[PDB]
Coordinates of C-alpha atoms in Angstrom, one line a residue:
Chain A
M1 CA -12.6 -26.4 6.3
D2 CA -10.3 -29.2 7.3
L3 CA -7.3 -26.9 8.1
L4 CA -9.6 -24.8 10.4
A5 CA -11.3 -27.9 11.8
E6 CA -7.8 -29.3 12.6
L7 CA -6.7 -26.1 14.4
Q8 CA -9.9 -26.3 16.3
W9 CA -9.2 -29.9 17.4
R10 CA -5.7 -28.8 18.4
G11 CA -7.0 -25.8 20.4
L12 CA -5.3 -23.2 18.3
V13 CA -8.3 -21.0 17.7
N14 CA -9.2 -18.6 20.5
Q15 CA -11.3 -16.3 18.4
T16 CA -12.2 -15.6 14.8
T17 CA -13.8 -12.6 13.2
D18 CA -16.1 -14.8 11.0
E19 CA -15.5 -18.6 11.0
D20 CA -17.8 -19.6 8.2
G21 CA -16.6 -16.7 5.9
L22 CA -12.9 -17.6 6.6
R23 CA -13.5 -21.4 6.2
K24 CA -15.1 -20.7 2.9
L25 CA -12.2 -18.5 1.6
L26 CA -9.5 -20.9 2.9
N27 CA -11.3 -23.7 1.0
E28 CA -11.6 -21.7 -2.2
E29 CA -8.3 -19.8 -2.5
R30 CA -4.6 -19.5 -1.6
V31 CA -4.9 -17.1 1.2
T32 CA -2.1 -14.6 2.0
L33 CA -2.0 -14.3 5.9
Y34 CA 0.4 -12.5 8.1
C35 CA 1.7 -12.5 11.7
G36 CA 3.8 -9.6 13.2
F37 CA 6.7 -10.0 15.7
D38 CA 8.2 -7.0 17.5
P39 CA 11.9 -7.0 18.6
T40 CA 11.6 -6.7 22.3
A41 CA 14.8 -8.7 22.8
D42 CA 17.6 -10.1 20.6
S43 CA 15.8 -13.4 20.3
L44 CA 12.3 -14.9 20.0
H45 CA 11.3 -17.2 22.8
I46 CA 8.8 -20.1 23.3
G47 CA 6.1 -17.5 23.7
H48 CA 6.2 -17.0 20.0
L49 CA 6.2 -20.7 19.0
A50 CA 2.4 -21.2 18.7
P51 CA 1.8 -18.3 16.3
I52 CA 5.0 -19.3 14.3
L53 CA 4.1 -23.0 14.0
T54 CA 0.5 -22.0 13.2
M55 CA 1.8 -20.0 10.2
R56 CA 3.7 -23.1 9.1
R57 CA 0.5 -25.2 9.4
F58 CA -1.2 -22.6 7.2
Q59 CA 1.7 -22.9 4.7
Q60 CA 1.5 -26.8 4.6
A61 CA -2.3 -26.5 3.7
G62 CA -1.2 -24.4 0.7
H63 CA -1.5 -20.8 1.9
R64 CA 1.1 -18.1 1.8
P65 CA 2.5 -16.8 5.0
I66 CA 4.1 -13.3 5.6
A67 CA 6.2 -13.0 8.8
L68 CA 6.3 -9.3 9.7
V69 CA 9.3 -8.0 11.7
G70 CA 8.2 -5.0 13.8
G71 CA 11.0 -2.6 12.9
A72 CA 8.7 0.5 13.3
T73 CA 6.3 -0.7 16.1
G74 CA 9.2 -2.2 18.2
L75 CA 10.1 1.6 18.5
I76 CA 6.6 2.4 20.1
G77 CA 5.7 -0.7 22.0
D78 CA 2.4 -2.6 22.3
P79 CA 0.5 -2.3 25.7
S80 CA -1.3 -5.5 24.8
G81 CA -0.9 -8.2 27.5
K82 CA 1.4 -5.8 29.4
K83 CA 0.2 -4.5 32.8
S84 CA 2.8 -1.8 32.7
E85 CA 4.1 0.9 30.4
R86 CA 7.4 -0.2 28.9
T87 CA 10.6 1.7 28.3
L88 CA 11.4 2.8 24.8
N89 CA 14.3 1.0 23.2
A90 CA 16.7 2.9 21.0
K91 CA 16.6 2.7 17.2
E92 CA 20.0 1.1 17.2
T93 CA 18.9 -1.6 19.6
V94 CA 15.7 -2.4 17.8
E95 CA 17.5 -2.2 14.4
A96 CA 20.0 -4.8 15.6
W97 CA 17.4 -7.1 17.2
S98 CA 15.2 -7.0 14.0
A99 CA 18.1 -8.6 12.0
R100 CA 18.4 -11.6 14.4
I101 CA 14.6 -12.1 14.7
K102 CA 14.4 -12.1 10.9
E103 CA 16.9 -15.0 11.0
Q104 CA 15.0 -17.2 13.6
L105 CA 11.7 -16.5 11.8
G106 CA 13.0 -17.9 8.5
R107 CA 13.8 -21.3 10.0
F108 CA 10.1 -22.2 10.4
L109 CA 8.9 -21.2 6.9
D110 CA 9.3 -22.4 3.3
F111 CA 11.0 -20.1 0.8
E112 CA 11.4 -22.8 -2.0
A113 CA 7.7 -23.6 -2.6
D114 CA 6.4 -22.1 -5.8
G115 CA 2.8 -20.8 -5.4
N116 CA 3.1 -20.2 -1.7
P117 CA 6.6 -19.3 -0.7
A118 CA 6.9 -17.1 2.4
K119 CA 7.9 -13.4 2.7
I120 CA 9.6 -11.9 5.8
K121 CA 8.8 -8.1 5.9
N122 CA 9.8 -5.1 8.1
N123 CA 7.1 -2.5 8.8
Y124 CA 9.9 0.1 9.1
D125 CA 9.8 0.3 5.3
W126 CA 6.4 1.9 5.2
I127 CA 6.2 3.4 8.7
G128 CA 9.7 4.8 8.8
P129 CA 9.1 7.3 6.1
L130 CA 5.5 8.3 7.0
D131 CA 5.0 11.9 8.2
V132 CA 2.9 12.6 11.3
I133 CA 0.4 14.8 9.3
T134 CA -0.3 11.9 6.8
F135 CA -0.6 9.5 9.7
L136 CA -3.1 11.7 11.7
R137 CA -5.3 12.4 8.6
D138 CA -5.1 9.2 6.5
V139 CA -5.2 6.7 9.5
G140 CA -6.5 8.8 12.5
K141 CA -9.6 10.3 10.9
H142 CA -11.0 6.7 10.7
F143 CA -10.9 6.1 14.5
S144 CA -12.9 7.8 17.3
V145 CA -11.2 7.9 20.7
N146 CA -14.3 6.0 22.0
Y147 CA -13.6 3.0 19.8
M148 CA -10.0 2.9 21.0
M149 CA -10.6 3.4 24.7
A150 CA -12.9 0.3 24.8
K151 CA -10.0 -1.9 23.5
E152 CA -8.9 -4.5 26.0
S153 CA -5.3 -3.3 25.8
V154 CA -6.3 0.3 26.8
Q155 CA -9.3 -0.4 29.0
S156 CA -7.0 -2.7 31.0
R157 CA -4.6 0.3 31.6
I158 CA -6.2 3.7 32.0
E159 CA -6.1 3.7 35.8
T160 CA -2.7 2.0 35.8
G161 CA -1.9 4.6 33.1
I162 CA -0.7 4.6 29.5
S163 CA 1.1 7.3 27.5
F164 CA -0.3 8.5 24.1
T165 CA 2.7 6.6 22.5
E166 CA 1.4 3.1 23.5
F167 CA -2.3 4.2 23.1
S168 CA -1.5 4.9 19.4
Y169 CA 0.3 1.6 18.7
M170 CA -3.0 0.1 17.5
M171 CA -3.1 2.6 14.7
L172 CA 0.3 1.4 13.4
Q173 CA -0.6 -2.3 13.5
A174 CA -4.0 -1.2 12.0
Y175 CA -2.0 0.4 9.1
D176 CA 0.2 -2.7 8.6
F177 CA -2.9 -4.8 7.9
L178 CA -4.1 -2.2 5.3
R179 CA -0.7 -2.0 3.5
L180 CA -0.3 -5.8 3.4
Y181 CA -3.9 -6.1 2.3
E182 CA -3.1 -3.7 -0.5
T183 CA 0.4 -4.7 -1.7
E184 CA 0.2 -8.4 -0.9
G185 CA -3.5 -9.4 -1.1
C186 CA -3.3 -10.2 2.6
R187 CA -6.8 -11.4 3.8
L188 CA -6.1 -12.8 7.2
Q189 CA -4.0 -11.7 10.2
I190 CA -3.3 -14.2 13.0
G191 CA -1.7 -13.5 16.5
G192 CA -1.7 -14.5 20.1
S193 CA -4.7 -14.0 22.3
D194 CA -3.8 -10.4 23.3
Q195 CA -3.8 -9.2 19.7
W196 CA -7.6 -9.3 19.1
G197 CA -8.0 -5.6 19.5
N198 CA -5.1 -4.7 17.2
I199 CA -6.4 -7.1 14.6
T200 CA -9.9 -5.9 14.6
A201 CA -8.5 -2.3 14.5
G202 CA -6.8 -3.3 11.2
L203 CA -10.2 -4.7 10.0
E204 CA -11.9 -1.4 11.0
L205 CA -9.3 0.5 9.0
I206 CA -9.8 -1.7 5.9
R207 CA -13.5 -1.5 6.1
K208 CA -13.5 2.3 6.4
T209 CA -11.0 2.8 3.6
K210 CA -12.3 0.2 1.1
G211 CA -15.7 -1.0 2.3
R212 CA -13.4 -9.0 3.0
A213 CA -10.6 -9.9 5.4
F214 CA -10.4 -11.9 8.7
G215 CA -8.6 -12.2 11.9
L216 CA -7.8 -15.2 14.0
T217 CA -6.1 -15.4 17.5
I218 CA -4.4 -18.3 19.2
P219 CA -5.2 -18.9 22.9
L220 CA -2.8 -18.2 25.7
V221 CA -0.9 -21.5 26.4
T222 CA -2.1 -22.9 29.7
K223 CA -0.6 -25.0 32.5
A224 CA -2.8 -27.3 34.6
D225 CA -1.1 -26.0 37.7
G226 CA -2.2 -22.4 36.9
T227 CA 1.3 -21.1 36.5
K228 CA 2.6 -19.1 33.5
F229 CA 3.6 -21.1 30.5
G230 CA 7.4 -20.7 29.9
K231 CA 8.0 -19.3 33.3
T232 CA 11.0 -21.3 34.4
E233 CA 13.3 -21.0 37.4
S234 CA 16.0 -20.6 34.8
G235 CA 14.3 -17.6 33.2
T236 CA 13.1 -17.6 29.5
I237 CA 13.5 -20.5 27.2
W238 CA 14.9 -18.7 24.1
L239 CA 15.0 -20.0 20.5
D240 CA 18.6 -18.8 20.3
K241 CA 20.8 -21.8 21.0
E242 CA 23.4 -19.4 22.5
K243 CA 20.9 -18.2 25.1
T244 CA 19.2 -21.5 25.7
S245 CA 21.3 -24.5 24.6
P246 CA 19.5 -27.3 22.8
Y247 CA 20.1 -29.5 25.9
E248 CA 18.2 -27.0 28.1
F249 CA 15.6 -26.5 25.4
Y250 CA 15.2 -30.3 25.3
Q251 CA 15.0 -30.7 29.1
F252 CA 12.4 -28.0 29.3
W253 CA 10.0 -30.0 27.1
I254 CA 11.0 -33.4 28.6
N255 CA 9.8 -32.0 32.0
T256 CA 6.3 -31.3 30.7
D257 CA 3.8 -32.3 33.4
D258 CA 1.6 -35.3 32.4
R259 CA -1.3 -32.8 32.8
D260 CA 0.0 -30.6 29.9
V261 CA 1.8 -32.9 27.6
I262 CA -1.2 -33.8 25.4
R263 CA -2.2 -30.1 25.0
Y264 CA 1.4 -29.3 24.0
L265 CA 1.7 -32.1 21.5
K266 CA -1.3 -30.7 19.7
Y267 CA 0.0 -27.1 19.9
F268 CA 3.6 -27.5 19.1
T269 CA 3.9 -30.6 16.9
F270 CA 3.2 -32.0 13.5
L271 CA 2.1 -35.4 14.8
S272 CA -1.3 -36.5 13.5
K273 CA -4.4 -36.9 15.5
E274 CA -4.1 -40.6 15.5
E275 CA -0.5 -40.3 16.6
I276 CA -1.4 -37.8 19.3
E277 CA -4.4 -40.0 20.4
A278 CA -2.2 -43.1 20.7
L279 CA 0.2 -41.2 22.9
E280 CA -2.7 -40.3 25.1
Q281 CA -3.6 -43.9 25.6
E282 CA 0.1 -44.7 26.2
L283 CA 0.1 -41.8 28.8
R284 CA -2.8 -43.5 30.6
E285 CA -1.4 -47.0 30.5
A286 CA 2.4 -46.3 31.1
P287 CA 3.0 -42.8 32.5
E288 CA 6.4 -43.6 34.1
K289 CA 7.8 -44.4 30.6
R290 CA 7.4 -40.7 29.6
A291 CA 6.7 -41.4 25.9
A292 CA 4.6 -38.3 25.3
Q293 CA 7.3 -36.2 26.9
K294 CA 10.2 -37.6 24.8
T295 CA 8.1 -37.3 21.6
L296 CA 7.4 -33.7 22.4
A297 CA 11.0 -32.9 23.3
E298 CA 12.4 -34.5 20.1
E299 CA 9.8 -33.1 17.8
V300 CA 10.1 -29.5 19.1
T301 CA 13.9 -29.5 19.5
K302 CA 14.3 -30.8 15.9
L303 CA 11.9 -28.1 14.6
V304 CA 13.8 -25.3 16.3
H305 CA 17.4 -26.5 16.4
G306 CA 17.5 -29.5 14.0
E307 CA 18.4 -33.2 14.4
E308 CA 22.1 -32.8 15.0
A309 CA 21.2 -30.4 17.8
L310 CA 18.6 -32.9 19.0
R311 CA 21.3 -35.7 18.8
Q312 CA 23.6 -33.8 21.2
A313 CA 20.8 -32.9 23.6
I314 CA 19.9 -36.6 23.8
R315 CA 23.5 -37.8 24.2
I316 CA 24.2 -35.0 26.8
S317 CA 21.1 -36.1 28.8
Chain B
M1 CA 3.0 45.0 36.2
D2 CA 1.3 48.0 34.6
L3 CA 0.9 46.2 31.2
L4 CA -0.8 43.3 33.0
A5 CA -2.8 45.6 35.3
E6 CA -3.9 47.5 32.2
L7 CA -5.1 44.3 30.4
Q8 CA -6.9 43.4 33.6
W9 CA -8.7 46.8 33.7
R10 CA -9.6 46.3 30.0
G11 CA -10.9 42.7 30.7
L12 CA -8.4 41.0 28.4
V13 CA -7.3 38.4 31.0
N14 CA -9.5 35.3 31.3
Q15 CA -6.9 33.1 32.9
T16 CA -3.2 33.0 33.6
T17 CA -0.9 30.1 34.6
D18 CA 0.9 32.3 37.3
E19 CA 0.1 36.0 37.4
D20 CA 2.8 37.0 39.9
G21 CA 5.5 35.1 38.1
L22 CA 4.5 36.5 34.7
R23 CA 4.1 40.1 36.1
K24 CA 7.6 39.8 37.5
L25 CA 9.2 38.6 34.2
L26 CA 7.2 41.1 32.1
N27 CA 8.6 43.8 34.4
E28 CA 12.2 42.5 34.3
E29 CA 12.7 41.4 30.6
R30 CA 11.8 41.7 27.0
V31 CA 9.5 38.7 26.8
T32 CA 9.0 36.8 23.6
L33 CA 5.4 35.7 23.4
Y34 CA 3.4 34.0 20.6
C35 CA -0.2 33.4 19.4
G36 CA -1.2 30.8 16.8
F37 CA -3.8 31.2 14.0
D38 CA -5.0 28.4 11.9
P39 CA -6.2 28.8 8.3
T40 CA -9.8 27.7 8.5
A41 CA -10.8 30.2 5.8
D42 CA -9.1 32.6 3.3
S43 CA -9.4 35.5 5.8
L44 CA -9.2 36.2 9.5
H45 CA -12.4 37.6 11.0
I46 CA -13.3 39.9 14.0
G47 CA -13.1 36.7 16.2
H48 CA -9.4 37.0 15.9
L49 CA -9.1 40.7 16.7
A50 CA -8.8 40.5 20.5
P51 CA -5.8 38.1 20.5
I52 CA -4.2 40.1 17.6
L53 CA -4.6 43.6 19.2
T54 CA -3.5 42.0 22.5
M55 CA -0.2 41.0 20.8
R56 CA 0.2 44.6 19.7
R57 CA -0.4 45.9 23.2
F58 CA 2.4 43.5 24.3
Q59 CA 4.6 44.9 21.5
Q60 CA 4.0 48.6 22.5
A61 CA 5.0 47.7 26.1
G62 CA 8.4 46.6 24.6
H63 CA 7.9 42.8 24.2
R64 CA 8.5 40.8 21.1
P65 CA 5.5 39.1 19.4
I66 CA 5.6 36.0 17.2
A67 CA 2.4 35.5 15.1
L68 CA 2.2 31.8 14.2
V69 CA 0.4 30.7 11.0
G70 CA -1.0 27.2 11.5
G71 CA 0.2 25.6 8.2
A72 CA 0.6 22.1 9.8
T73 CA -2.2 22.2 12.4
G74 CA -4.8 23.7 9.9
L75 CA -4.3 20.3 8.3
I76 CA -5.5 18.5 11.5
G77 CA -8.0 20.9 13.1
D78 CA -8.6 21.9 16.7
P79 CA -11.7 20.6 18.4
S80 CA -11.4 23.5 20.9
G81 CA -14.6 25.6 21.0
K82 CA -16.1 23.4 18.3
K83 CA -19.1 21.2 19.3
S84 CA -18.6 19.1 16.1
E85 CA -15.8 17.3 14.3
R86 CA -14.8 19.3 11.3
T87 CA -13.9 18.2 7.8
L88 CA -10.3 18.0 6.8
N89 CA -9.3 20.7 4.3
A90 CA -6.8 19.9 1.5
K91 CA -3.1 20.8 1.7
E92 CA -3.6 23.1 -1.4
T93 CA -6.5 24.9 0.3
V94 CA -4.7 25.4 3.6
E95 CA -1.4 26.3 1.8
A96 CA -3.3 29.0 -0.1
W97 CA -5.1 30.3 2.9
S98 CA -1.9 30.5 5.0
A99 CA -0.4 33.0 2.5
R100 CA -3.4 35.4 2.9
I101 CA -3.6 35.1 6.7
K102 CA 0.1 35.8 6.9
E103 CA -0.7 39.1 5.0
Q104 CA -3.5 40.2 7.3
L105 CA -1.5 39.3 10.4
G106 CA 1.4 41.6 9.4
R107 CA -0.8 44.7 9.4
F108 CA -1.2 44.7 13.2
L109 CA 2.5 44.3 14.1
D110 CA 5.8 46.2 13.9
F111 CA 8.6 44.9 11.8
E112 CA 10.7 48.1 12.0
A113 CA 11.4 48.3 15.7
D114 CA 14.9 47.3 16.7
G115 CA 14.9 45.2 20.0
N116 CA 11.3 43.9 19.6
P117 CA 10.4 43.5 15.9
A118 CA 7.8 40.8 15.2
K119 CA 8.2 37.5 13.4
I120 CA 5.4 35.7 11.5
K121 CA 6.1 31.9 11.5
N122 CA 4.5 28.8 9.9
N123 CA 4.5 25.6 12.0
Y124 CA 4.6 23.6 8.7
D125 CA 8.3 24.2 8.8
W126 CA 8.9 22.0 11.8
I127 CA 5.8 19.8 11.7
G128 CA 5.8 19.1 8.0
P129 CA 9.0 17.2 8.0
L130 CA 8.4 15.3 11.3
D131 CA 8.0 11.5 11.1
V132 CA 5.3 9.8 13.0
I133 CA 7.8 7.6 15.0
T134 CA 9.6 10.7 16.2
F135 CA 6.4 12.4 17.1
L136 CA 5.0 9.4 19.1
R137 CA 8.2 8.9 21.1
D138 CA 9.6 12.4 21.6
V139 CA 6.2 14.1 22.2
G140 CA 3.7 11.3 23.0
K141 CA 5.8 9.6 25.7
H142 CA 5.3 12.7 27.8
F143 CA 1.4 12.5 27.8
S144 CA -0.8 10.0 29.5
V145 CA -4.3 9.5 27.8
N146 CA -5.8 10.4 31.2
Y147 CA -4.3 13.9 31.2
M148 CA -5.6 14.5 27.6
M149 CA -9.1 13.1 28.2
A150 CA -9.7 15.6 31.1
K151 CA -9.1 18.5 28.7
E152 CA -12.1 20.7 28.2
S153 CA -11.8 20.4 24.3
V154 CA -12.0 16.5 24.6
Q155 CA -14.2 16.1 27.7
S156 CA -16.6 18.4 25.9
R157 CA -16.7 15.9 23.0
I158 CA -16.4 12.1 23.8
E159 CA -20.1 11.4 23.7
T160 CA -20.6 13.7 20.8
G161 CA -17.5 11.9 19.4
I162 CA -14.0 12.9 18.3
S163 CA -11.6 11.2 16.0
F164 CA -8.0 10.4 17.0
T165 CA -7.0 13.2 14.5
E166 CA -8.5 16.0 16.5
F167 CA -7.7 14.3 19.9
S168 CA -4.0 14.6 18.9
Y169 CA -4.1 18.2 17.8
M170 CA -3.1 19.3 21.4
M171 CA 0.2 17.4 21.0
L172 CA 1.1 19.5 17.9
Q173 CA 0.2 22.9 19.6
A174 CA 2.1 21.5 22.6
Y175 CA 5.1 20.9 20.3
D176 CA 4.9 24.4 18.8
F177 CA 5.4 26.0 22.2
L178 CA 8.4 23.8 22.9
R179 CA 10.1 24.6 19.6
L180 CA 9.5 28.4 19.9
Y181 CA 10.6 28.2 23.5
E182 CA 13.8 26.6 22.3
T183 CA 14.6 28.5 19.0
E184 CA 13.1 31.9 20.0
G185 CA 13.3 32.1 23.8
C186 CA 9.5 32.2 23.8
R187 CA 8.2 32.3 27.4
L188 CA 4.6 33.2 27.0
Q189 CA 1.8 31.9 24.8
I190 CA -1.5 33.8 24.6
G191 CA -4.8 32.8 23.0
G192 CA -8.6 33.0 23.1
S193 CA -10.5 31.4 26.0
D194 CA -10.8 28.0 24.4
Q195 CA -7.0 27.5 24.1
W196 CA -6.3 27.0 27.8
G197 CA -6.0 23.3 27.5
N198 CA -3.6 23.5 24.4
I199 CA -1.5 26.1 26.2
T200 CA -1.1 24.2 29.4
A201 CA -0.3 21.1 27.3
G202 CA 2.6 23.1 25.8
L203 CA 3.6 23.9 29.4
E204 CA 3.4 20.3 30.4
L205 CA 5.6 19.3 27.5
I206 CA 8.3 22.0 28.3
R207 CA 8.3 21.1 32.0
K208 CA 8.7 17.4 31.2
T209 CA 11.5 18.0 28.6
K210 CA 13.4 20.7 30.4
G211 CA 12.2 20.9 34.0
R212 CA 9.8 28.9 33.4
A213 CA 7.1 29.8 30.9
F214 CA 3.5 31.1 31.1
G215 CA 0.2 31.0 29.4
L216 CA -2.5 33.7 29.2
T217 CA -6.0 33.5 27.6
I218 CA -8.4 36.3 26.6
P219 CA -12.0 35.9 27.5
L220 CA -14.8 35.2 25.0
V221 CA -16.2 38.5 23.8
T222 CA -19.7 39.0 25.3
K223 CA -22.9 40.7 24.3
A224 CA -25.4 42.1 26.9
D225 CA -28.2 40.4 25.0
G226 CA -26.6 37.0 25.3
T227 CA -26.1 36.5 21.6
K228 CA -22.9 35.5 19.9
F229 CA -20.3 38.3 19.3
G230 CA -19.8 38.8 15.6
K231 CA -22.9 36.8 14.7
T232 CA -24.5 39.1 12.2
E233 CA -27.5 38.6 9.9
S234 CA -25.1 39.4 7.1
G235 CA -22.8 36.5 8.2
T236 CA -19.1 36.9 9.3
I237 CA -17.4 40.3 9.6
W238 CA -14.1 39.5 7.8
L239 CA -10.9 41.5 7.9
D240 CA -10.5 41.2 4.1
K241 CA -12.0 44.3 2.6
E242 CA -13.1 42.2 -0.4
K243 CA -15.3 40.0 1.8
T244 CA -16.5 42.7 4.1
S245 CA -16.1 46.3 2.7
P246 CA -14.8 49.0 5.1
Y247 CA -18.3 50.5 4.9
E248 CA -19.9 47.3 6.2
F249 CA -17.0 46.8 8.7
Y250 CA -17.6 50.4 9.9
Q251 CA -21.4 50.0 10.1
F252 CA -21.0 46.8 12.1
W253 CA -19.1 48.8 14.9
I254 CA -21.3 51.8 14.6
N255 CA -24.3 49.6 15.5
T256 CA -22.8 48.5 18.8
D257 CA -25.4 48.4 21.4
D258 CA -25.0 51.0 24.2
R259 CA -24.7 48.0 26.6
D260 CA -21.6 46.7 24.8
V261 CA -19.8 49.8 23.5
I262 CA -17.7 50.5 26.6
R263 CA -16.5 46.8 26.9
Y264 CA -15.6 46.9 23.1
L265 CA -13.7 50.2 23.4
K266 CA -11.4 48.6 26.1
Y267 CA -11.0 45.4 24.1
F268 CA -10.5 46.7 20.6
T269 CA -9.0 50.2 20.9
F270 CA -5.9 52.1 22.0
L271 CA -7.9 54.9 23.8
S272 CA -6.6 55.5 27.3
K273 CA -8.5 54.8 30.4
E274 CA -9.2 58.5 30.9
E275 CA -10.5 58.7 27.3
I276 CA -12.6 55.5 27.7
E277 CA -14.0 56.8 31.0
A278 CA -14.9 60.2 29.6
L279 CA -16.8 58.4 26.8
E280 CA -18.7 56.4 29.5
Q281 CA -19.9 59.6 31.1
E282 CA -20.7 61.0 27.6
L283 CA -22.7 57.7 27.0
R284 CA -24.6 58.4 30.2
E285 CA -25.4 62.0 29.6
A286 CA -26.0 62.0 25.8
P287 CA -26.7 58.5 24.4
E288 CA -28.5 59.6 21.2
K289 CA -25.3 61.3 20.1
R290 CA -23.6 57.9 19.7
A291 CA -20.1 59.2 20.5
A292 CA -18.8 56.0 21.9
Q293 CA -20.1 54.2 18.8
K294 CA -18.4 56.5 16.3
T295 CA -15.1 56.5 18.2
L296 CA -15.1 52.7 18.2
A297 CA -16.1 52.5 14.6
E298 CA -13.3 55.0 13.5
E299 CA -10.6 53.5 15.8
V300 CA -11.2 49.9 14.7
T301 CA -11.7 50.6 11.0
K302 CA -8.4 52.6 10.9
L303 CA -6.6 49.8 12.7
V304 CA -7.8 47.2 10.2
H305 CA -8.3 49.1 7.0
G306 CA -6.5 52.5 7.5
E307 CA -7.7 56.1 7.3
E308 CA -8.4 56.4 3.6
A309 CA -10.6 53.3 4.0
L310 CA -12.2 55.0 7.0
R311 CA -12.7 58.2 5.0
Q312 CA -14.7 56.3 2.4
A313 CA -16.8 54.5 5.0
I314 CA -17.6 57.8 6.6
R315 CA -18.5 59.5 3.3
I316 CA -20.4 56.5 2.1
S317 CA -22.5 56.5 5.3

C-alpha cells in the first residue's frame, strides 16, 4: 500500500506478478520475502545494493527478509543478464566465497527485531543432497521445454549458445522458492531486472505443486549518459573495504553526475521524499555546491562501511 | 567383417557411426558392447527380440555382451519412438519390474564362456547415488541445448510437448555409455532404430571427456501390409509364458504372412544363409505347406521358451 507506493515513487519496481494482490497482502500481513545472491566473486559489489537495500526497506515496514546465499546455484551459474556462457567455479572457491558474502549480507539486515528478524540461508543445504532422479521427476515433470526456451535468459542465448547446465539453472532457483515457501512461509521473491524469468519459474513450480505468492523485480540502474552503472575506469566498486577502500567508495558516489544524483538518492538512501525533493531544488538553484552528491556519498558510505569509515573518507578527501 | 556382413545380409543394421572403423575393431579384438532395456512393464515383449538376439549373435562371434537393465532411466522415461509424454512409474514398480526383466534377459546370453561371458547390469547403481549438481556440471556442461533440440526424439515432440524430465533422459543414457566405456572397456552400443540420438549423445559425451567407440542401431521390424509388427488383436506378445503362453507365442509366429516370413527368419533365427535361402525356394514352390512358418515358429519358441515348451505348443496345436 504505502510501502509499495513508496517503492514506486523511488523507481524500485520494474515488474510485479500482481500489484493489487501483493499490495493487499503486504497491508494485511507480515510477509516473508527472499532475495538470492550467488557467489561469483569473494565480495558483493554496488550491483547488489538495490536489491539489498530494498530488502531492508521491506524489513523497516515490518516484513521479514530472508537473504539466500547461492551455495548450490553458484556451482551451476545463471545465464540471466549474461551474453556468454561462464566458466564453472570449483566447490572450494564457491564454498569460500559464500562465507564472505554471508558476512556482507548481514550488515544490511536486522537480526535483533522480534517479529521480523532476518534469516541468511544457503541453498546448498537442500540442493547439495538432492539426487538427480528426484530432481528430474519432482521438479522437471512440471516444466515443458517450450516454457523454458521462451525465457528471456535462454531466448537471449540459443544462437549464441548455452549448455544444458545453465539452461537448467532456472529449475534450481524455481526449487528454492518452493522450499522457502514451504519451510518459511515465503510469499514474495524480489530480484534485479534480469531475474523475472527465474522468479516466475518459481511461481509456476508452486502453482503446479500446490495450486498465492508474488514476484517483484527492481529495474536496471541507469545513467543519463547511457553507460553502464558501476562501470568505472578503476573497475568494480566492491563492498569489501579491502578491495575498494571507503575513500574510493565515497569518491565514487561524490562523482555522481547531476543527471543521476536524484535517481540514486531515491534508490540507495533512506532520505524521505521531502528531503529528497528539497535536494532536487537545491540541485537546481546551487549545482556547484554539490549537496545532493555529498548527501548520497555520506548516506551510502555509512550504510555500507559505517560512520568511522565515513569519517576517514571525509578527512582523506 | 564377416559378422557385420552377416548382419547386413540379415537386415539388422539400420545405421552405424563408422562401418569401416567398427568392422576393423570387431575383426581385431574382443569387443565389449552393450544394449539397455528399461522396465516399462513386468515383462519384455517381441519388440525387444531383435536387439536381444543381435547381442547373442555378437556373443557367438566371440564378443562380450553387457545387458543393461534401466533401473534409473525407467524412472525418467525415454521419449524416443513415443509420440506422447508418458506417466512416471513409481520406484517400487520399476524396482520390481527390473528384477523380472533381468531374469528374461539372462536366457538369451552365455554366462559360462570364458573370455566373453555376459554381464547383466543396472544403471541405478551409478545413477541412483548421483547428486544433481554433479550431474549438471560433469554431464550437462558438455551439451548445448541446440545439440539436444535437434535430436529426432525431441524435434519430434516440441509442438506436441515434452517435459524437461524426458528432454534430459538422453543425458542419462549418454552417461551410461561413458561409465561402461570406463569400467568395462565398452566400445560399442547397439539399440533399436529409435535409439540413434541417445547413442550418438553417449559418443558426444565420450569424445568431449576423453577425446574410439561406435554405435549401431537395428531397423524397425516391418510388415508387408504396412501394419505395426507385434500389433495383434490379442494385444502384446510377451516373453513371459504366464502372460503369453508358449502355445500363443507359437501361433503368433506360425501365422506369419508369406510376405514377412523370410525377413523374420533372418532377423529372429540362427538358421544359416543356405538354410534360409532353401526355405525361400520352398516358399516359392510349395507355399501351402508352410515350412518357413513352422521353422520360424519352432526356432523362436525354443529360443524363448525351450524345447519342452515347444513340444507342448506343438501337441496343443
